[PDB]
Design a protein around this ligand. Structure first.
Ligand SMILES: [Mg+2]
Ligand SMILES: [Mg+2]
Ligand SMILES: [Mg+2]
Ligand SMILES: [Mg+2]
Ligand SMILES: [Mg+2]
Ligand SMILES: [Mg+2]
Ligand SMILES: [Mg+2]
Ligand SMILES: [Mg+2]
Ligand SMILES: [Mg+2]
Ligand SMILES: [Mg+2]
Ligand SMILES: [Mg+2]
Ligand SMILES: [Mg+2]
Ligand SMILES: [Mg+2]
Ligand SMILES: [Mg+2]
Ligand SMILES: [Mg+2]
Ligand SMILES: [Mg+2]
Ligand SMILES: [Mg+2]
Ligand SMILES: [Mg+2]
Ligand SMILES: [Mg+2]
Ligand SMILES: [Mg+2]
Ligand SMILES: [Mg+2]
Ligand SMILES: [Mg+2]
Ligand SMILES: [Mg+2]
Ligand SMILES: [Mg+2]
Ligand SMILES: [Mg+2]
Ligand SMILES: [Mg+2]
Ligand SMILES: [Mg+2]
Ligand SMILES: [Mg+2]
Ligand SMILES: [Mg+2]
Ligand SMILES: [Mg+2]
Ligand SMILES: [Mg+2]
Ligand SMILES: [Mg+2]
Ligand SMILES: [Mg+2]
Ligand SMILES: [Mg+2]
Ligand SMILES: [Mg+2]
Ligand SMILES: [Mg+2]
Ligand SMILES: [Mg+2]
Ligand SMILES: [Mg+2]
Ligand SMILES: [Mg+2]
Ligand SMILES: [Mg+2]
Ligand SMILES: [Mg+2]
Ligand SMILES: [Mg+2]
Ligand SMILES: [Mg+2]
Ligand SMILES: [Mg+2]
Ligand SMILES: [Mg+2]
Ligand SMILES: [Mg+2]
Ligand SMILES: [Mg+2]
Ligand SMILES: [Mg+2]
Ligand SMILES: [Mg+2]
Ligand SMILES: [Mg+2]
Ligand SMILES: [Mg+2]
Ligand SMILES: [Mg+2]
Ligand SMILES: [Mg+2]
Ligand SMILES: [Mg+2]
Ligand SMILES: [Mg+2]
Ligand SMILES: [Mg+2]
Ligand SMILES: [Mg+2]
Ligand SMILES: [Mg+2]
Ligand SMILES: [Mg+2]
Ligand SMILES: [Mg+2]
Ligand SMILES: [Mg+2]
Ligand SMILES: [Mg+2]
Ligand SMILES: [Mg+2]
Ligand SMILES: [Mg+2]
Ligand SMILES: [Mg+2]
Ligand SMILES: [Mg+2]
Ligand SMILES: [Mg+2]
Ligand SMILES: [Mg+2]
Ligand SMILES: [Mg+2]
Ligand SMILES: [Mg+2]
Ligand SMILES: [Mg+2]
Ligand SMILES: [Mg+2]
Ligand SMILES: [Mg+2]
Ligand SMILES: [Mg+2]
Ligand SMILES: [Mg+2]
Ligand SMILES: [Mg+2]
Ligand SMILES: [Mg+2]
Ligand SMILES: [Mg+2]
Ligand SMILES: [Mg+2]
Ligand SMILES: [Mg+2]
Ligand SMILES: [Mg+2]
Ligand SMILES: [Mg+2]
Ligand SMILES: [Mg+2]
Ligand SMILES: [Mg+2]
Ligand SMILES: [Mg+2]
Ligand SMILES: [Mg+2]
Ligand SMILES: [Mg+2]
Ligand SMILES: [Mg+2]
Ligand SMILES: [Mg+2]
Ligand SMILES: [Mg+2]
Ligand SMILES: [Mg+2]
Lengths: 158, 217, 173, 62
RNA sequence: AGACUAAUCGAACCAUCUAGUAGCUGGUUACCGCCGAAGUUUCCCUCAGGAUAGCAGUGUCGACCUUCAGUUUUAUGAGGUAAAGCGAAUGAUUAGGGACUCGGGGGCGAUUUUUAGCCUUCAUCCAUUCUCAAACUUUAAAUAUGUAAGAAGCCCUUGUUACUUAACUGAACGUGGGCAUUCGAAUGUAUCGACACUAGUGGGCCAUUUUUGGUAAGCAGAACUGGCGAUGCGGGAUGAACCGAACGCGGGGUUAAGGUGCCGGAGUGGACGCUCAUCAGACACCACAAAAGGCGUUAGUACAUCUUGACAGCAGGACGGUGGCCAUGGAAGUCGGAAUCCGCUAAGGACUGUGUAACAACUCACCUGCCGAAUGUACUAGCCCUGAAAAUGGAUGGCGCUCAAGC
RNA sequence: AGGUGUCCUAAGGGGGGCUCAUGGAGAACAGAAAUCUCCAGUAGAACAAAAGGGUAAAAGUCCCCUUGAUUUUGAUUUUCA
RNA sequence: CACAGGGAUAACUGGCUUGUGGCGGCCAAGCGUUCAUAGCGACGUCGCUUUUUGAUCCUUCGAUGUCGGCUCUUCCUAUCAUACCGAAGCAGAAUUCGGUAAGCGUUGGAUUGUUCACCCACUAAUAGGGAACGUGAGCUGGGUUUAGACCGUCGUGAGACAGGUUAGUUUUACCCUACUGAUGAACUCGUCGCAAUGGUAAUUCAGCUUAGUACGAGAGGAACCGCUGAUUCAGAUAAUUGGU
């Protein structure tokens, strides 16, 4: 029984099938600012600035920006309490996250949709609601006559 | 040695095949799998019968050969050496261990008890499921009674419960008897050594025509 | 139990690619309409790729006997599970309605073959129109010409609270 | 003699006994770990902007 | 002889140091009220013991802050287990066919043979075929898991700097202004945040699903959750852990698990069937029984025969060519060897036996007369029976029970 | 089922040209196997060592120059109180 | 050799398990001159038992006296003999396989501490086991297992050896229950009787006769009744003989 830094990462850090080789070059052209939401995904090819296996899949908030790395803040759950962790990750491993895009899309839409009604003068009912039970309707059997079914007798295949 | 078969009846461990990690396993007991006229054409033998399992258990290598010999003798005597083809479709790849309590930990005491109790290889066994096929026989249509009796006689060497089913296919092919007969008349079936190959109309047109001359008229 | 026949009609939820899906109808024997719907989804899950989460129920009705005061013979086709394997049978019954035959069949299979309600499928129930299509011999004797029979050795009924009778009873009722 | 080696049977119930406490987020995070070069300049920037806004009463009126 | 030295000797007896030390046994004194545990993490010549974190009590302060959550919904990330795959890589594995001769082996036409002659047995290659993988994989679930759902928000205008840019171009932090008529998913909030001091515990055990070593164990070792320990009450006759359900002192009403022939509070209650045991059977955990058999009985599957009349019994007949070809002291159906046609018919065989030196006689086969509606073979699964042998007398809890008081 | 108490002035750092294992067809002595030439070749080679991951105008291979294996102290991750 | 403790931990019974040990089935290639199943049974496979030995460590370390024999009672059947029967490759005689059956029996000695074993002789027969591996306030103390002493191998030495050898203290019942016998209050004192329930007993062999008969080519060679005695056991008795 041993506990190394990369123990148990046989499949986690490996590249996929038919995906070895050159790193797509658009990765290094992205930009980050403090307060952004990023998520960690370790790339096997790059061996520098690689975070521990615990953070492979977690999401955090950028708090520092440097020449080729960003600082992320993530919350770790030790038994009975949470702890704040600060890690340094090379940009080949981080990626912008679409977790908050639905919220940012909705706030812009709400502001403009509320503006037009206030000029017009009608309530909007803007906030969302869960799915409701269906309503009454009618179904016609014209040229859609139902077909009768029945269970089938036992039969041997092989 | 050779503990009674009652002690290794239930699948209780993950599969343990022979590899570069375990070494020194004894050579299995069964070698031959096909018997009889094992090179007849498909058209000669249109009747097939099966011996289907009905339990999730383990079948020893020793028992597999005992049933093979028992069924072979009856078929040869009553149907002729050239009137059937028998195939055994269960292969033993699972290795069962033994803890020699007195050989390893007797006389000279060394260490006795349950201390260091990982065992040594002792034999080879086959894993089967519900509905799995065990033994198949193909022959003529006039040998239905002989084939059924031969299979019924050889189940006394197996533990558990087994059934006998007369298949609805043609020989060992995975086609219905009616479907294969009419497809062959269309020229889409070509003869091979004891088996057949089928036309697939998804290649270059040149050699599909010579391989199946009767398909195109 | 105490059953009655329903008809229940279901449908796959309509979608933009397939508006107006097909309609399926079954006949189900069930104590009440709450379990009548449940059996419909069970039988349909074995024939088409439809679930309850992606379907809906169009209509459920009650079918009543047309002539519940006429005696007639019935025949039932069914499959069931034994302790090892599945089988098919065909039995017959004599009574006045369709509903009671299913009641009689369920009690019959539970006694002679130890088959529960969980493991019986009903394929088809048909009323035998003629008299020469009766197969089983325990119904042929009940349709003989000029049937009549006595009832020997029938115990009289005595109140269960009246102990210590004063004279010997008789069995010639 | 021999005894039990390890266990985790009652740890989950013990932790949830009085809650799993998440530290409170707050408006102004600390600047520990930020690179010093940006830290030095940020100090000079805030010194000037306070003086300019202080002069707003007898001065620029921006 | 480790013998004897005042009943004391492998180091005498008497007082004092001395209330010698003990991680180890034993005990530790009135009542009521409220809250209420741990056998687990890290280190120790540590494993019968201590320190450290956790679980626990009490004292409070900050607001009554509208903050919060062992939960669902909507949007968006991570994974390599169950299953699946091998005419897909690596590893294992069964069988024929086609193509090749110079790969090895054995022949042939004069083993002539440098004859790519004629043969062929392995090997090789190509299109197919039968089974597998805890330390193999192109694919890939269910259950669980990270983040987000705004006032500390969104938008416009333009000050500071020693950082950054060719550059007031950016970057962080800001002044001023604009946006509520609705602060932007559900449900709950019978319990919000922070601090101080300290007790006991650090031998654990049982069960459903997943699961490792072992022939197996009331055996040894783990993961998620619920229990006993620390806990009575109603059912399982009895029984720390199973089912129902958790407790201040009483009165009336209704149930749960389990029960209603008697012991025993409440049915010898109702409907349709199955079973007869000279070892019946009788309620989860649970206190045991298997392979293989039955013309005991019940229900069912398939095929074949039958009013042109079968199955059983009795009753009539049982014919030619021809003693066939052969065999021969003699064999005429019937020692033996090798063939199997025809006449007459409704039917009787160049015959299944008995039998003659050899014929004969006799039987069977086949068909006919009598009768009155069913019959034959092979399989499937219910209760019951055989398989079924241990030591004091004996236990469905007991009595006893048979269209049950059994299933 | 296996491994460690070591080894290296390059087997460390920068730059540049080239492409490997293997197979088919050819050339005096030369053959199963020596050196030379062309075509195919997704890594089936190589990278000090146990096993897993990673690498093709390179992280492999040869050539050219060098000592970031240096100086002053802080923050962060893994085992974890 | 000593002390503080431990059934958190071994050596013996009991409990769970049955690998090994023992015992019993199912299938049918073949053996048996011919013929799978009179009598056997390969290759496989399903069970039972707790008189073998292992595995485990739940109960006892402020103690449950630890080998064997002698003595005495009872229970189990997987039946060695005896009673009555069914099968055969059962002519007779002698044997072999199976059923109902535990009523009744199962011995005397040489060597060894032995359990186990091995020979001599008799017999209808000399079957296998349980009861805390029955049985020490019942005995005995040969063995093992304190202190004395000797040898061999090992150790520099003190000493070690499931290697051999010789000498070595065996305590208490009057209490409660159980068992074997003996008295006895209450309804006046006596004599003569009935019988609920509990206990229960007999066992085996030989000679004569049937008969040198049935059966068989021969060699060989039985049985039922009938008659008279004997072995093991049980309850009494003292005329005679013996002992005191
Ligand atoms: Mg690990
Ligand atoms: Mg990956
Ligand atoms: Mg490095
Ligand atoms: Mg055995
Ligand atoms: Mg296992
Ligand atoms: Mg512990
Ligand atoms: Mg708990
Ligand atoms: Mg001495
Ligand atoms: Mg003195
Ligand atoms: Mg003295
Ligand atoms: Mg002294
Ligand atoms: Mg003193
Ligand atoms: Mg003191
Ligand atoms: Mg003292
Ligand atoms: Mg209280
Ligand atoms: Mg409380
Ligand atoms: Mg210890
Ligand atoms: Mg203690
Ligand atoms: Mg508290
Ligand atoms: Mg995987
Ligand atoms: Mg894994
Ligand atoms: Mg799998
Ligand atoms: Mg797949
Ligand atoms: Mg493969
Ligand atoms: Mg392969
Ligand atoms: Mg081949
Ligand atoms: Mg896997
Ligand atoms: Mg999610
Ligand atoms: Mg500790
Ligand atoms: Mg402590
Ligand atoms: Mg313990
Ligand atoms: Mg303790
Ligand atoms: Mg218990
Ligand atoms: Mg355990
Ligand atoms: Mg234990
Ligand atoms: Mg409780
Ligand atoms: Mg109780
Ligand atoms: Mg009970
Ligand atoms: Mg009832
Ligand atoms: Mg009552
Ligand atoms: Mg009744
Ligand atoms: Mg009877
Ligand atoms: Mg039956
Ligand atoms: Mg029938
Ligand atoms: Mg007839
Ligand atoms: Mg029985
Ligand atoms: Mg009873
Ligand atoms: Mg009983
Ligand atoms: Mg009861
Ligand atoms: Mg009834
Ligand atoms: Mg009752
Ligand atoms: Mg009932
Ligand atoms: Mg190891
Ligand atoms: Mg270099
Ligand atoms: Mg380089
Ligand atoms: Mg380079
Ligand atoms: Mg690789
Ligand atoms: Mg750890
Ligand atoms: Mg103990
Ligand atoms: Mg056993
Ligand atoms: Mg033979
Ligand atoms: Mg037999
Ligand atoms: Mg055998
Ligand atoms: Mg034992
Ligand atoms: Mg013990
Ligand atoms: Mg003790
Ligand atoms: Mg005691
Ligand atoms: Mg005692
Ligand atoms: Mg003696
Ligand atoms: Mg017996
Ligand atoms: Mg006998
Ligand atoms: Mg007796
Ligand atoms: Mg003697
Ligand atoms: Mg014993
Ligand atoms: Mg004893
Ligand atoms: Mg004594
Ligand atoms: Mg003794
Ligand atoms: Mg005693
Ligand atoms: Mg002695
Ligand atoms: Mg001594
Ligand atoms: Mg002394
Ligand atoms: Mg010496
Ligand atoms: Mg000695
Ligand atoms: Mg002695
Ligand atoms: Mg002496
Ligand atoms: Mg006495
Ligand atoms: Mg004579
Ligand atoms: Mg004589
Ligand atoms: Mg005699
Ligand atoms: Mg006497
Ligand atoms: Mg005298």
């Amino acid at each position: 029984h041993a506990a190394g830094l990369r123990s148990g990462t046989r499949y986690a850090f490996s590249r996929g099938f038919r995906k070895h080789g050159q790193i797509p070059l658009s990765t290094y052209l992205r930009t980050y600012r403090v307060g952004d939401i990023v998520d960690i995904k370790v790339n096997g090819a790059v061996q520098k600035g690689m975070p521990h296996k615990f953070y492979h899949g977690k999401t955090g908030v950028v708090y520092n920006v440097t020449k080729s790395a960003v600082g992320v803040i993530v919350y770790k759950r030790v038994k009975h309490r949470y702890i704040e962790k600060r890690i340094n990750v090379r940009i080949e491993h981080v990626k912008p996250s679409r977790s908050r895009e639905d919220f940012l899309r909705r706030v812009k839409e709400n502001a403009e949709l509320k503006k037009k009604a206030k000029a017009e003068g009608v309530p909007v009912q803007l906030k969302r609601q869960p799915a409701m039970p269906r309503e009454a309707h009618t179904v016609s059997i014209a040229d859609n006559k139902p077909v009768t079914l029945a269970p089938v007798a036992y039969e041997t295949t092989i | 040695a050779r503990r009674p078969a009652r002690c290794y009846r239930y699948c209780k461990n993950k599969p343990y095949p022979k590899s570069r990690f375990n070494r020194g396993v004894p050579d299995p007991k069964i070698k031959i799998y096909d018997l009889g006229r094992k090179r007849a054409t498909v058209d000669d033998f249109p009747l097939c019968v099966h011996l289907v399992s009905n339990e999730y258990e383990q079948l020893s290598s020793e028992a597999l050969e005992a049933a093979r010999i028992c069924a072979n003798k009856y078929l040869v005597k009553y149907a002729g050496k050239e009137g059937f083809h028998l195939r055994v479709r269960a292969h033993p790849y699972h290795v069962i261990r033994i803890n020699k309590m007195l050989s390893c930990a007797g006389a000279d005491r060394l260490q006795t008890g349950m201390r260091g109790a990982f065992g040594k290889p002792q034999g080879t066994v086959a894993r089967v499921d519900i509905g799995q096929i065990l033994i198949s026989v193909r022959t003529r249509d006039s040998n239905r009674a002989i084939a059924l009796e031969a299979l019924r006689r050889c189940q006394y060497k197996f533990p558990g419960r087994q059934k006998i089913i007369v298949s609805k296919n043609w020989g060992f092919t995975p086609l219905r008897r009616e479907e294969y007969l009419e497809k062959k008349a269309a020229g889409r079936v070509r003869v091979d050594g004891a088996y057949v190959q089928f036309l697939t109309n998804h290649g270059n047109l040149e050699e599909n025509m010579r391989r199946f001359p009767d398909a195109f008229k | 139990g105490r059953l009655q026949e329903y008809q229940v009609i279901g449908r796959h939820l309509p979608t933009e690619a397939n508006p107006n899906p097909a309609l399926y109808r079954m006949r189900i024997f069930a104590p009440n309409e709450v379990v009548a719907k449940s059996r419909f989804w069970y039988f349909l899950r074995g024939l088409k790729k439809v679930k309850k989460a992606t379907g809906e129920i169009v209509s459920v009705n009650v079918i009543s006997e047309k002539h519940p005061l006429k005696v007639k013979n019935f025949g039932i086709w069914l499959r069931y599970d034994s302790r090892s394997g599945t089988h098919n049978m065909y039995k017959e019954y004599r009574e006045t309605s369709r509903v009671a035959a299913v009641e009689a069949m369920y009690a019959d299979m539970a006694a002679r073959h130890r088959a529960r309600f969980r493991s019986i499928h009903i394929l088809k129930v048909v009323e035998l129109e003629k008299t020469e299509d009766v197969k089983r011999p325990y119904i042929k004797q009940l349709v003989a010409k000029n049937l009549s029979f006595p009832l020997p050795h029938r115990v009289p009924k005595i109140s269960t609270k009246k102990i210590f009778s004063a004279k010997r009873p008789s069995t010639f009722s | 003699a021999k005894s039990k080696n390890s266990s985790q049977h009652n740890q989950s119930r013990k932790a949830h006994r009085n809650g799993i406490k998440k530290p409170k987020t707050q408006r102004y995070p600390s600047l520990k770990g930020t690179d010093p070069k940006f830290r030095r300049n940020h100090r000079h920037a805030l010194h000037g902007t306070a003086k300019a806004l202080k002069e707003f009463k007898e001065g620029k009126r921006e």
